[PDB]
Amino acid sequence: LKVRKYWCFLLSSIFTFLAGLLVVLLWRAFAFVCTFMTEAKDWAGELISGQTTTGRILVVLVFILSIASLIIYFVDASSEEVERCQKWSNNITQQIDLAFNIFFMVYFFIRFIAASDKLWFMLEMYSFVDYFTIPPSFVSIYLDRTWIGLRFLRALRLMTVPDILQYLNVLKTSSSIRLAQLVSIFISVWLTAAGIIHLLENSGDPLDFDNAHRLSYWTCVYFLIVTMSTVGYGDVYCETVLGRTFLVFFLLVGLAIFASCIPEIID
């Protein structure tokens, strides 16, 4: 605890994104000097879209585990400290987190096979969630320490709920589909923004981390809703430079996007 090992978690996530990106380019370069893909890509297409009987099982199961994974983060965020040292067997939360991540890793591989374009699949917004969530876990299980990191990014998976419902033919009316999309976007952004504020405020300013503003995750949720509604009580506010820096950008695009969202939700 004398020296923070947060860069080790960040370095692996950056390396995984960089290594995965160049391999696709390297494979294209390797394809210049150089079936299963005909069957697997078509087969994986129905698996992710829930067209086959086994495809719907995967679609429903990943829907449930996405909800359960976010709950695991909620109890994790309840910890007062940002970095903890503990063995894998000591805590059962880490074991269950590992159980959910291996499923999210094989599911990531399945979509990669079903992806028609490999370069854009790596650069899609969904893959960045996996890059900053899965590789951190193996680093934690290897170095034998845990860190809050960027674990709040699984809240971004809540915006695929309308896609899952449409795959199972649950939503049919256009109004119902539009309402579900807007609700998922508002909730996912609200929870993700709270996680960013919670991490930045608690960790403190980089490279010295002497100004740590103790702030509970649920208090951050109450802080964001006040900020979004332009109420600004001032009882809870950001003090760190990075906390204020992110708030400046959130006030620009977060309110602008939500300007046309709530009016078309109430009607």
Partner 1 sequence: AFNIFFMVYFFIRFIAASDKLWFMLEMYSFVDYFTIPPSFVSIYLDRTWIGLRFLRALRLMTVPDILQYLNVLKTSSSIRLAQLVSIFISVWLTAAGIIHLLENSGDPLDFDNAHRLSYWTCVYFLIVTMSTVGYGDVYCETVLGRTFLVFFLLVGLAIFASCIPEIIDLIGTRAKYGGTLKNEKGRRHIVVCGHITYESVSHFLKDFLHEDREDVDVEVVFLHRKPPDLELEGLFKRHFTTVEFFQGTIMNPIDLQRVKVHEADACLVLANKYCQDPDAEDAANIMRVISIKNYSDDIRVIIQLMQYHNKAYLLNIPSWDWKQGDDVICLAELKLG
Ligand X SMILES: CCCCCCCCCCCCCCCCCC(=O)O[C@H](COC(=O)CCCCCCCCCCCCCCC)COP(=O)(O)OCC[N+](C)(C)C
Please, how many CA atoms are within 13 Å of residue 55, restricted to the half-sphere of its CB? 17
Binding residues vs ligand X (CB under 6 A): 67, 70, 156, 158, 161, 170-173, 176, 179-180, 183-185, 187, 189, 192, 196, 205-208, 210-211, 216, 218-219, 221-222, 241, 244-245, 248, 253, 257, 260
Q: Among 232, 235, 249, 267, which residue sits at the site for K ion (rule: CB under 5 A)?
A: 232
**Closest distance between ligand CLR and the C-beta of residue 209, in Å?**
7
263 forms part of the interface with K ion (CB under 5 A): no
203 binds ligand CLR (CB under 6 A): yes
CA dihedral over 58, 162, 128, 84, signed as positive or negative: negative
Measured from the CB atom, is 2 or 172 closer to partner 1? 172
Query: Rounded to an integer, what distance in angstroms lies between the CA atom of residue 30 and that of residue 32?
Result: 5
Q: Of 232 and 263, which has the nearer Cβ to K ion?
A: 232
Q: Give me the helix-helix angle, 241-259 and 217-228, nearest 10°.
A: 50
Size of the site for ligand CLR (CB under 6 A): 5
Is the sign of the CA dihedral 42, 47, 49, 54 positive or negative? positive
Shortest distance, position 189 Cβ to partner 1, whole Å: 14
Binding mask 31-70 for partner 1 (x = CB under 8 A): -----------x--xx--x-x-------------------
> Is residue 178 near partner 1 by the rule CB under 8 A?
yes
The two structure tokens encoding residue 53: 């009987």
Sequence-ordered list of residues with C-beta below 8 angstroms from that of 87, at least 6 positions apart, any chain: 144
* Residue of 117, 126, 206, 257 interacting with ligand CLR (CB under 6 A): 206
* By CB under 8 A, residue 87 contacts partner 1: no
The reply on whether position 8 binds ligand CLR by CB under 6 A is no
Asked if 10 is part of the footprint of ligand CLR (rule: CB under 6 A), the reply reads yes
Ramachandran quadrant class, 209 (left: phi over 0; alpha: psi -120 to 50; beta: rest) = left
Out of 177, 182, 185, 212, the residue judged to bind partner 1 by CB under 8 A: 177
Q: What is the dihedral of CA 221, 196, 17, 187, to 10 degrees?
A: 20
- 157 contact partners, CB below 8 Å, separation of at least 6: 66, 69, 70, 129, 188
Closest by Cα among 130, 131, 121, 137 to 15: 131
CA atoms within 13 A on the CB side of 112: 14
Question: Closest residue to ligand CLR, Cβ-based?
Answer: 203
What is the binding site for partner 1 (CB under 8 A)?
Answer: 42, 45-46, 49, 51, 116-117, 163, 166-167, 169, 171-174, 177-178, 227, 230-232, 234, 237, 239, 244-245, 247-248, 251-253, 255-257, 259
Applying CB under 6 A, the residues found at the interface with ligand CLR are 10, 17, 199, 203, 206
